[PDB]
Amino acid sequence: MNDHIHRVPALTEEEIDSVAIKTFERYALPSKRKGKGVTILWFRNDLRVLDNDALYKAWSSSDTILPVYCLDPRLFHTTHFFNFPKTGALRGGFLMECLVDLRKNLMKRGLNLLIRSGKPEEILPSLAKDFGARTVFAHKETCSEEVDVERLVNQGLKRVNSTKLELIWGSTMYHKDDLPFDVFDLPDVYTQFRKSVEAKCSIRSSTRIPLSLGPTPSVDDWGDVPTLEKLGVEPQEVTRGMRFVGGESAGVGRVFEYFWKKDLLKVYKETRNGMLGPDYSTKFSPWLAFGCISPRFIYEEVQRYEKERVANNSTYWVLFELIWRDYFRFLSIKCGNSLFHLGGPRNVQGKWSQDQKLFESWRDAKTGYPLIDANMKELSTTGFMSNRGRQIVCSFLVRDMGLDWRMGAEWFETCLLDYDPCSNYGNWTYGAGVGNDPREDRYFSIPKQAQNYDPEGEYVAFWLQQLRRLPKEKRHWPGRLMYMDTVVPLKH
Ligand SMILES: Cc1cc2nc3c(=O)[nH]c(=O)nc-3n(C[C@H](O)[C@H](O)[C@H](O)COP(=O)(O)OP(=O)(O)OC[C@H]3O[C@@H](n4cnc5c(N)ncnc54)[C@H](O)[C@@H]3O)c2cc1C
Numbered sequence: 001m002n003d004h005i006h007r008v009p010a011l012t013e014e015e016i017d018s019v020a021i022k023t024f025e026r027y028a029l030p031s032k033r034k035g036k037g038v039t040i041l042w043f044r045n046d047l048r049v050l051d052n053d054a055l056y057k058a059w060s061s062s063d064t065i066l067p068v069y070c071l072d073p074r075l076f077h078t079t080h081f082f083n084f085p086k087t088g089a090l091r092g093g094f095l096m097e098c099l100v101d102l103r104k105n106l107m108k109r110g111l112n113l114l115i116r117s118g119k120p121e122e123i124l125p126s127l128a129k130d131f132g133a134r135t136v137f138a139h140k141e142t143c144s145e146e147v148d149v150e151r152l153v154n155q156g157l158k159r160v161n162s163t164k165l166e167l168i169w170g171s172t173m174y175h176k177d178d179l180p181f182d183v184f185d186l187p188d189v190y191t192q193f194r195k196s197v198e199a200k201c202s203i204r205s206s207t208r209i210p211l212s213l214g215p216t217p218s219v220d221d222w223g224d225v226p227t228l229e230k231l232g233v234e235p236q237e238v239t240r241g242m243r244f245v246g247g248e249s250a251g252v253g254r255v256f257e258y259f260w261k262k263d264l265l266k267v268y269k270e271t272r273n274g275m276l277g278p279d280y281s282t283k284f285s286p287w288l289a290f291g292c293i294s295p296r297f298i299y300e301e302v303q304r305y306e307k308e309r310v311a312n313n314s315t316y317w318v319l320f321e322l323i324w325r326d327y328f329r330f331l332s333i334k335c336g337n338s339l340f341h342l343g344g345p346r347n348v349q350g351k352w353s354q355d356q357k358l359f360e361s362w363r364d365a366k367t368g369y370p371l372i373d374a375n376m377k378e379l380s381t382t383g384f385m386s387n388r389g390r391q392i393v394c395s396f397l398v399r400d401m402g403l404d405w406r407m408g409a410e411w412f413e414t415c416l417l418d419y420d421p422c423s424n425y426g427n428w429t430y431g432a433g434v435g436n437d438p439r440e441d442r443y444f445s446i447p448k449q450a451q452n453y454d455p456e457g458e459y460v461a462f463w464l465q466q467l468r469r470l471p472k473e474k475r476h477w478p479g480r481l482m483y484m485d486t487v488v489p490l491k492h
């Protein structure tokens with residue numbers, strides 16, 4: 001049944017393990033450790049061992065480490081404004097896989113992974129007291145929901161006050177402390193930010209981790225990774241398109257696959273606007289979202305590729321694209337919750353429709369427009385959508401359907417494996433024209449976009465069976481009778 005189903009990476013479990021081992025070794029910290037006492041390493045979206053500063057700082061300042069992951073109940077409630085599931089089944093499955101792999105990789109280094117179900121502010125203070133932990137390490141987050149959790153955990157520790165919460169920044173290519181400006185003065189135009197950081201910042205080298213990470217505390221029950229039904233979520237199968245394999249191993253496997261095995265890095269720029277297949281682009285996003293791989297690691301591999309293979313505009317463009325990710329992270333700090341408001345960071349006034357019927361046709365891939373439906377179907381079936389497609393469906397929902405852009409944003413939040421509040425709401429803000437950079441505040445012509453990015457209509461055909469046997473031109477505009485009625489006319 002795995003017909004037209006593409007495993008990402010395509011590598012077999014065996015190949016992934018092999019590639020992962022040699023990657024770990026290539027970056028291993030040569031055979032020192034001072035520190036003292038016990039320390040708790042709280043994960044949350046940085047599910048990897050490699051370039052992990054929180055892990056290093058933890059090991060560097062202790063005798064024994066207790067790595068922990070809390071399955072936050074809130075993660076499986078509903079979305080903010082329109083109440084879609086907080087985490088869709090596909091991303092949930094990806095997460096479980098990430099935890100399985102993280103535990104495996106941690107055990108390889110003499111550690112393990114304590115899995116607990118509950119709120120971090122309740123679990124961590126308890127564990128800190130039970131093991132007499134001196135500190136709790138973890139990465140610093142930026143959006144309000146995550147920052148609020150940090151506050152609660154911090155106050156929880158004090159409420160019990162011999163354990164300090166140590167939040168380490170580390171999720172971007174360029175470090176926050178190395179920027180040419182304070183985040184409050186982040187340029188509102190990406191171009192200004194990009195040029196500025198490229199010329200005045202320099203990227204830090206990846207943090208090398210020892211192959212042996214000392215012992216863990218005693219612990220009589222490390223728990224286990226839940227099924228999903230146990231979490232109130234019903235497993236979902238990818239029936240066509242890309243599946244995506246969770247975990248750092250698979251992630252490092254994809255970098256290897258895209259750069260070295262397939263040698264596609266040198267042509268990335270000329271294919272990045274594709275919409276069909278795993279080859280047109282990196283496909284790193286889901287692993288970057290859960291922190292299974294880091295941008296600094298990617299940068300090092302790009303440099304090694306430019307040193308051993310070739311260097312051109314394509315090898316560079318992957319970095320250019322990672323600066324977009326960095327930009328939205330910093331933007332989330334400067335914008336705060338205005339990133340989530342209807343008026344956006346520019347607080348634009350006006351009214352938008354929340355027409356349930358219209359939104360449902362968009363979400364259900366039944367708008368009558370092949371280019372639109374194909375993308376929406378890919379999204380709900382695989383949890384991924386090309387950048388080109390995301391831009392298009394955003395323009396369509398906002399401009400053509402005139403719907404509250406947040407309805408589209410939250411649906412993306414439910415479905416995307418690579419969902420990230422900064423990137424998601426950041427880009428939606430751009431496309432919906434409610435941000436402070438007019439770059440994407442225009443209009444995407446479905447007919448033009450379809451012709452330029454899917455001339456043979458093979459993308460739309462791959463997803464919409466009704467168009468499989470139709471000629472090139474019919475795939476672009478099949479007509480209501482050969483496809484279905486259009487839920488709304490085109491144009492503002
Ligand atoms: C309306 C809209 C909403 C989006 N919401 C999210 C989201 O919640 N999470 C998410 O990870 N991506 C989001 N994107 C992502 C962008 O389209 C994807 O980051 C890129 O397609 C992801 O992987 P790739 O392999 O296709 O990219 P390439 O293969 O294009 O890889 C470039 C890498 O750089 C980063 N990147 C590329 N483009 C962007 C961008 N425009 N903004 C931020 N980072 C970028 C990613 O980490 C990506 O893996 C959104 C795009 C739009 C238009």
Ligand SMILES: Nc1nc(=O)c2c([nH]1)NC[C@@H]1CN(c3ccc(C(=O)N[C@@H](CCC(=O)O)C(=O)O)cc3)CN21
Pocket residue numbers: 080143144145146337340341413420421
């Ligand atoms: N990963 C992630 N982190 C988040 O913080 C987050 C998401 N995802 N998904 C979308 C929701 C919604 N976002 C929001 C939206 C609005 C406010 C807000 O209006 N706050 C008010 C005060 C509200 C109150 O006091 O009840 C404010 O003035 O800022 C906050 C967070 C945060 N969200």
